[PDB]
Design an enzyme around this catalytic site. Structure first.
Site, PDB file in Angstrom:
ATOM      1  CG  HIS A   1     -10.813  70.944   4.402  1.00  0.00           C
ATOM      2  ND1 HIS A   1     -11.293  71.558   3.150  1.00  0.00           N
ATOM      3  CD2 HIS A   1     -10.435  69.539   3.657  1.00  0.00           C
ATOM      4  CE1 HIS A   1     -11.543  70.761   2.255  1.00  0.00           C
ATOM      5  NE2 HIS A   1     -10.932  69.785   2.310  1.00  0.00           N
TER       6      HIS A   1
ATOM      7  CB  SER B   1      -7.303  63.629   4.568  1.00  0.00           C
ATOM      8  OG  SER B   1      -6.080  63.705   3.847  1.00  0.00           O
TER       9      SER B   1
ATOM     10  CE  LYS C   1      -4.879  58.261  -7.004  1.00  0.00           C
ATOM     11  NZ  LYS C   1      -3.913  58.062  -5.641  1.00  0.00           N
ATOM     12  CG  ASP C   2     -10.375  63.015  -6.459  1.00  0.00           C
ATOM     13  OD1 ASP C   2      -9.797  63.950  -6.011  1.00  0.00           O
ATOM     14  OD2 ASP C   2     -10.626  62.049  -6.235  1.00  0.00           O
TER      15      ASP C   2
ATOM     16  CD  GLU D   1     -34.837  48.883  -5.718  1.00  0.00           C
ATOM     17  OE1 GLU D   1     -34.006  48.513  -6.144  1.00  0.00           O
ATOM     18  OE2 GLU D   1     -35.855  48.903  -6.198  1.00  0.00           O
TER      19      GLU D   1
END
Ligand SMILES: CCCCCCCCCCCCCCCCCC(=O)OC[C@H](COP(=O)([O-])OCC(O)COP(=O)([O-])OC[C@@H](COC(=O)CCCCCCCCCCCCCCCCC)OC(=O)CCCCCCCCCCCCCCCCC)OC(=O)CCCCCCCCCCCCCCCCC
Ligand SMILES: CCCCCCCCCCCCCCCCCC(=O)OC[C@H](COP(=O)([O-])OCC[N+](C)(C)C)OC(=O)CCCCCCCCCCCCCCCCC
Ligand SMILES: CCCCCCCCCCCCCCCCCC(=O)OC[C@H](COP(=O)(O)OCCN)OC(=O)CCCCCCCCCCCCCCCCC
Ligand SMILES: CCCCCCCCCCCCCCCCCC(=O)OC[C@H](COP(=O)(O)OCCN)OC(=O)CCCCCCCCCCCCCCCCC
Ligand code: HEC
Ligand code: HEM
Ligand code: HEM
Ligand code: HEM
Lengths: 76, 101, 49, 68, 60, 240, 380, 51, 54
Positions: G201, G205, G227-228, G271
């Site tokens: 911030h 971005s 959207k998120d 894994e």
């Protein structure tokens, strides 16, 4: 920048928008959604696909080489 | 030669920023020299550049491109930012040489 | 001139009940708002469940 | 002795297929090569494994409809 | 005659508190109806296999 | 030999995405475990109260618990004593310690079959292929005493004698006890013992599938409704 | 006056970070992924907290407590499998977040990139010790293997490994301190994520075109809010179908046996999200060289901002480096496949060529390709 | 890194060598003291009495 | 309790909660410092100390 007061200097730019309640949320969804998707696919497929084709070939070859290596030889 | 020029047009079409209406100098990453050269631009080229950038961002937002008649053709891609960038680069090299000696 | 500008045609995006410019609004705005808020309310019911 | 396991019937019916008898005769050739010889260190686990792979694939295709 | 979303907007969807009340009442009735429907679908897919389908032979 | 064999894919009734277990088969498999498998193998994470509402009723599982005698103590003078079993009692161990199991089973240790479906590749297909796959060894394979040829076992030399045959037990519901039927029943019981939440997991998955089939287009419609301001926005450049 | 959202000192932070934050209009669904990571982190913490309400970090009862969670606690199987598949989902979202940052030139935000690299190291350590925690066969043997590779360090390695072990091998003290560290590290991960958001911030971005998006910026609310939320709901669809329909397609069966120091498994793997690093380490026929290969693989991921020799930021208009990037992603897929295979022919030579091509693509081929593109575009 | 290749930067580096070497001596002495390193503290005379 | 009395589940969940709450206390202390730093500290005279700050 920092905040919506000052980010960039824009001159002579007009933009038009409508209310969300006055336009359809899926305006001709399939009829213009199909050709745009195939257009993006034609733009990106030659850069994306052949490395993964090579991965599939290498994976199959290495697997079958492993099961041929696990078998016995008839010379003894 | 002519083959290199034809291959360079083919690479220009494969790069794809002409489909958004962008010029060559619109796609430069804003470093310090690039921001200084942008700040040295005349206001007409500055306004044209930022309208082209805004239109390209809008087209990328809706995942579309311009019509093919509106694409930036190869022989009308004028390098507007290039002499300002050369001036900024040369004076930064002069300052670097003076600080170096 | 500022009178030279015109809003372009949005009829590819507009709803069918606001497509005609010679008929008024406000006898169909409640239907459009009810449809959108019904979508929002059903989403809220599912998220609450 | 009068009650019949369906697995035996499905197994012999799967031994009546095509590639199963080729694996069977390959295992017969392995058995005749190994058993009719002396001072060897060769087993017939591979041909037996191929035979059971084909046979048990056929059995697992069609066994559980005969089980209550 | 007005359209059904027009009546829903005029009665329930206009005020936010009535919107929340409609959401809550629909949450109760939707929970009950979907529980019935999903249980019926799962039991119809698994007829004769669940314990509740075979427990009558062992309740004696 | 280090070369091995894959078990095939069997059409189980619980193989489907939303298909439950057959609880009658689990009841028969518990009978198979009690009458055959419990002499050597343990179920340390499965108790009798887990059978209530799955295979048996309350009084049936209570009778099953009361027909075995378990360890209790200490009393008022600190002495261990035997007692009839209860519903909260777990399934009894055949041996007090694994060294006693190794001594009784010719060195080999019979594993605890509570996760033996989930701890083996192939699941219950491997168990069904192992129990029904005892065969004579091929030529060139010499096999010691106390070992048995099983091609589905890794190394093809298992220390377990073939534990099931035809009429190896008598079922309570009159099902004919063939070797394949008994093996299928005990494999279903072992799959239940490995995953006791399986039916509830698939019912919850069906409810989740229906809620997401409702909620994906509605949330997508809400997103497109809010983004239609931007996605239909027109731009114009009018320099003077 | 009454604009509390921008006058209240608590509320102005949430406002400035999520409501009135100027975001680029054209960012794709890839920019969802980091937000998913934060939500997935919260999910892990919540599930872990309930998994901490019934788990005992004792070697005689850790496996017993895991079975008691899965069998006797109401919906305890749901919480455990949501925790495990949420770890897998977290690493999926990390890989896609890192791939977005590599592709779109987001590494030029150098402080955000370095705080991310520290976050990735912390998350990998947390997931490793969390996988040690259920005390199965594979947990104990993977911990033993990884600590032996740590013991490959000369002159200080053996004492450091017996200090980390708390003894002679992986034992009671190792399991209890691994439970303590596995509890405490996700809160440090959350604080480092706060620092991550602070630096981003500060700098703003990026957008997929790599251009200055100051001319076309929109508020975060309600566009990227909805959207998120759509992205979170899609991620929960994939997580819940992975939990409720295929709970064991990513896990390993041998972890369902108790830990036996006498019995070793025939093939020991970590894994799936550690398999590419395991294949990178295992390809070099040396111990210290392999450990340095793993550390320097993640370190050249950190070193990536110093290798950018192009006048364009993103790869949207760079097709040769696009081809090299997809070859690199393909090579990472090959390394993930090789890491789950034992050491026989031809897996050694395939993994060796894969690791050599990985380091050659990252360190050599991409800046050379960028220079060739700058020549071809007539920049200089 | 040809930006810092000049006589002024060489003079600055030459001026800052002894301070950096003294700080490296500080770091080495602190590392030996904190880790109680036996390869060095067995040679210092007064420190030998604690071993 | 997780049961009829204070038992093993109570002790294990108390271990989890006792582990996790001091980090929430640290976050609340950060909020505490922010809410103090909007206005500065008080002085023992209770007066406006704006003329004398260090
Ligand atoms: C033939 C192929 C299909 C063609 C087709 O349907 O085209 C229509 C349409 C064509 O798109 P378009 O009109 O050219 O432009 C896209 C829109 O402007 C804007 O649409 P969009 O796709 O950008 O929407 C936002 C985006 C937002 O994406 C997200 O939120 C997803 C973020 C990532 C989640 C990852 C989870 C973990 C993954 C692990 C692996 O959503 C998606 O990508 C998919 C949403 C699906 C909703 C549920 C549908 C049922 O296709 C889509 O929109 C794609 C999704 C179709 C479903
Ligand atoms: C708590 C007491 C100390 C507080 C800090 C302090 O006063 O530091 C003194 C001073 C700062 O306080 P100062 O303001 O008195 O500094 C005066 C500095 N001179 C004398 C050079 C003008 O800190 C230092 O000098 C550095 C201290 C650390 C030294 C390196 C580590 C030693 C151990 C290695 C293992
Ligand atoms: C993934 C499958 C393929 C997805 C796809 O179609 O990608 C093409 C897409 C094109 O995007 P672009 O070039 O910007 O063009 C937009 C113009 N319409 O290009 C992209 O979406 C590029 C971004 C993809 C990022 C994710 C892929 C890589 C994931 C693994 C990264 C691993 C990084 C290293 C980790 C260990 C260290
Ligand atoms: C030449 C044109 C393409 C071929 C003929 C087809 C012509 C079709 C014409 C119709 C229009 C199609 C759509 C066009 C869309 C945009 C243009 C495009 O896609 O171009 C092709 C593309 C990129 O081409 P470009 O990057 O410009 O070439 C650089 C060369 N100077 O892609 C290519 O050029 C192909 C790239 C292939 C890459 C192969 C990589 C193989 C190796 C992968 C290894 C992965 C695993 C590695 C493991 C290592 C360890 C074992
Ligand atoms: C005593 C004779 C036993 C009877 C009765 C049953 N089992 Fe057993 N089993 C026994 C031993 C000594 C061993 C270990 C031998 C070895 O070679 O390891 C086993 C092993 C198994 C296994 C594990 C197979 C594996 O790959 O690890 C299974 C799945 C198994 N046994 C199943 C099983 C069933 C279902 C039984 C009831 C019909 C049963 N066994 C009975 C000893 C004995
Ligand atoms: C502070 C929050 C967390 C707590 C309290 C916590 C606690 C636990 C506990 C008690 C277990 C053992 C139970 C089990 O085996 O399922 C566990 C397992 C595990 N945790 Fe966490 N955890 C937390 C966060 C995370 C995070 C952020 C990750 C990484 C994404 C993670 C990855 C794992 C993994 C991979 C396992 C092994 C799963 C398995 O094999 O069963 N945990 N955790
Ligand atoms: C712990 C997991 C992580 C979380 C929670 C996280 C969180 C976030 C968030 C919320 C954003 C802003 C939204 C977005 O653009 O996606 C973001 C962006 C970013 N993150 Fe992360 N991140 C994580 C891991 C990483 C890692 C490992 C890296 C380094 C490779 C990284 C580097 C970046 C960069 C460069 C951006 C800027 C994106 C852009 O503007 O293009 N992050 N992260
Ligand atoms: C968790 C324990 C606490 C911590 C770590 C903490 C921390 C602090 C710190 C660092 C300060 C600034 C330095 C100072 O003025 O002393 C402060 C001031 C203050 N705290 Fe706390 N505090 C705590 C508990 C409390 C409680 C319980 C109250 C309420 C009764 C409180 C009310 C205040 C007030 C009113 C001030 C302002 C001091 C003044 O200007 O006169 N604090 N606190």
């Amino acid at each position: 920048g920092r905040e919506f007061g000052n980010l960039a200097r824009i001159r002579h730019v007009i933009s038009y928008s409508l209310s969300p309640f006055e336009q359809r949320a899926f305006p001709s969804y399939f009829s213009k959604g199909i050709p745009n998707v195939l257009r993006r696919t034609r733009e990106r497929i030659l850069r994306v696909a052949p490395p993964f084709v090579v991965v599939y070939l290498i994976y199959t070859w290495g697997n079958q080489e492993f099961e041929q290596s696990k078998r016995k030889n008839p010379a003894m | 030669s002519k083959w290199l020029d034809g291959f360079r047009k083919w690479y220009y079409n494969a790069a794809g920023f002409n489909k958004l209406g962008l010029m060559r100098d619109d796609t430069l990453h804003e470093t310090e020299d690039v921001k200084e050269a942008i700040r040295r631009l005349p206001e007409d080229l500055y306004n044209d550049r930022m309208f082209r950038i805004k239109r390209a961002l809008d087209l990328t937002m809706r995942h579309q491109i311009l019509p093919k008649d509106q694409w930036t053709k190869y022989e009308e891609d004028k390098f507007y930012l290039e002499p300002y960038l050369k001036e900024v680069i040369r004076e930064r090299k002069e300052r670097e040489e003076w600080a170096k000696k | 001139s500022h009178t030279d500008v015109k809003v372009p045609d949005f009829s590819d995006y507009r709803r069918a009940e606001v497509l005609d410019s010679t008929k008024s609004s406000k006898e169909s705005s409640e239907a459009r708002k009810g449809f959108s808020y019904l979508v929002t309310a059903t989403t809220t019911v599912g998220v609450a469940y | 002795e009068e009650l019949v396991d369906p697995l035996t019937t499905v197994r012999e019916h799967c031994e009546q297929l095509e590639k199963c008898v080729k694996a069977r005769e390959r295992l017969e050739l392995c058995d005749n090569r190994v058993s009719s010889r002396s001072q060897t260190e060769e087993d017939c686990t591979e041909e037996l494994f191929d035979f059971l792979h084909a046979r048990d694939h056929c059995v697992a295709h069609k066994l559980f409809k005969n089980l209550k | 005659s007005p359209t059904i979303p027009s009546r829903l907007y005029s009665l329930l969807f206009r005020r936010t508190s009535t919107f929340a009340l409609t959401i809550a009442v629909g949450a109760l009735f939707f929970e009950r109806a979907f529980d019935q429907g999903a249980d019926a679908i799962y039991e119809h897919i698994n007829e004769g296999k669940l314990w509740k389908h075979i427990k009558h032979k062992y309740e004696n | 030999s280090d070369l091995e064999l894959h078990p095939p894919s069997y059409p189980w009734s619980h193989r489907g995405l939303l298909s439950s277990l057959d609880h009658t088969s689990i009841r028969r498999g518990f009978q198979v475990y009690k009458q055959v498998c419990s002499s050597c193998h343990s179920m340390d994470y499965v108790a009798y109260r887990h059978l209530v509402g799955v295979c048996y009723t309350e009084e049936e599982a209570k009778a099953l618990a009361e027909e075995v005698e378990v360890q209790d103590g200490p009393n008022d003078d600190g002495e261990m004593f035997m007692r009839p079993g209860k519903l909260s009692d777990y399934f009894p161990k055949p041996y007090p310690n694994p060294e006693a199991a190794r001594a009784a089973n010719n060195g080999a240790l019979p594993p605890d079959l509570s996760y033996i479906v989930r701890a083996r590749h192939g699941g219950e297909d491997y168990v069904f292929s192992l129990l029904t796959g005892y065969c004579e060894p091929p030529t060139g394979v010499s096999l010691r005493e106390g070992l048995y040829f099983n091609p589905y076992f890794p190394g093809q030399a298992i220390g377990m004698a073939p534990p099931i045959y035809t009429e190896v037990l008598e079922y309570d519901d009159g099902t004919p006890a063939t070797m394949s039927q008994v093996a299928k029943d005990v494999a279903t019981f072992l799959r239940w013992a490995s995953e006791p939440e399986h039916d509830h997991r698939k019912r919850m998955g069906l409810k989740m599938l229906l809620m997401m089939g409702l909620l994906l287009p509605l949330t997508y419609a809400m997103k497109r409704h809010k983004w239609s301001v931007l996605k239909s926005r027109k731009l114009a450049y009018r320099p003077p | 006056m009454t604009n509390m959202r921008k006058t209240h000192p608590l509320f102005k932070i949430i406002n400035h970070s999520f409501i009135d934050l100027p975001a680029p209009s054209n960012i794709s669904s890839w920019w969802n992924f980091g937000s998913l990571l934060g939500v997935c982190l919260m999910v892990q913490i919540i599930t872990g907290l309930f998994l901490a309400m019934h788990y005992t970090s004792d070697t005689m009862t850790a496996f017993s407590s895991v079975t008691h969670i899965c069998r006797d606690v109401n919906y305890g199987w749901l919480i455990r499998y949501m925790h495990a598949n949420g770890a897998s989902m977290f690493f999926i979202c990390l890989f896609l977040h890192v791939g977005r940052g590599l592709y779109y030139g987001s590494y030029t935000f150098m402080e955000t990139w370095n705080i991310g690299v520290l976050l990735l190291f912390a998350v990998m350590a947390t997931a490793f010790m969390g996988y040690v925690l259920p005390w199965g066969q594979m947990s104990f043997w993977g911990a033993t293997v990884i600590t032996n590779l740590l013991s490959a360090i000369p002159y200080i390695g053996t004492t450091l490994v017996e200090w980390i072990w708390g003894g002679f091998s992986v034992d009671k003290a190792t399991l209890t301190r691994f439970f303590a560290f596995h509890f405490i590290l996700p809160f440090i991960i959350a604080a480092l994520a706060i620092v991550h958001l602070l630096f981003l911030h500060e700098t703003g971005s990026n957008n997929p075109t790599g251009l200055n998006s100051d001319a076309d910026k929109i508020p975060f609310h309600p566009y990227y809010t909805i959207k998120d939320i759509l992205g979170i709901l899609i991620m929960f669809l994939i997580l819940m179908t992975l939990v409720l329909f295929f709970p064991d397609m990513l896990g390993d069966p041998d972890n369902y046996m108790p830990a036996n120091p006498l019995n070793t498994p025939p093939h020991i793997k970590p894994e799936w999200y550690f398999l590419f690093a395991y294949a990178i380490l295992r390809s070099i026929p040396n111990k210290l060289g392999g450990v340095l290969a793993l550390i320097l693989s993640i370190l050249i991921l950190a070193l990536m901002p110093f290798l950018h020799t192009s006048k364009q930021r993103s790869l949207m208009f760079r097709p040769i480096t696009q081809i090299l990037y997809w070859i690199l992603v393909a090579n990472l897929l090959i390394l993930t496949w090789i890491g789950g295979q034992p050491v026989e022919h031809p897996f050694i030579i395939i993994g060796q060529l894969a690791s050599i091509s990985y380091f050659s693509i990252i360190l050599i081929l991409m800046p050379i390709s960028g220079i060739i593109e700058d020549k071809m575009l007539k920049l200089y | 890194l040809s930006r810092f290749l000049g006589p002024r930067y060489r003079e600055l580096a030459r001026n800052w060598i002894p301070t950096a070497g003294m700080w490296g001596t500080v770091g080495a002495v602190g590392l030996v003291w904190a880790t109680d390193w036996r390869l060095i503290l067995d040679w210092v005379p007064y420190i030998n009495g604690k071993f």
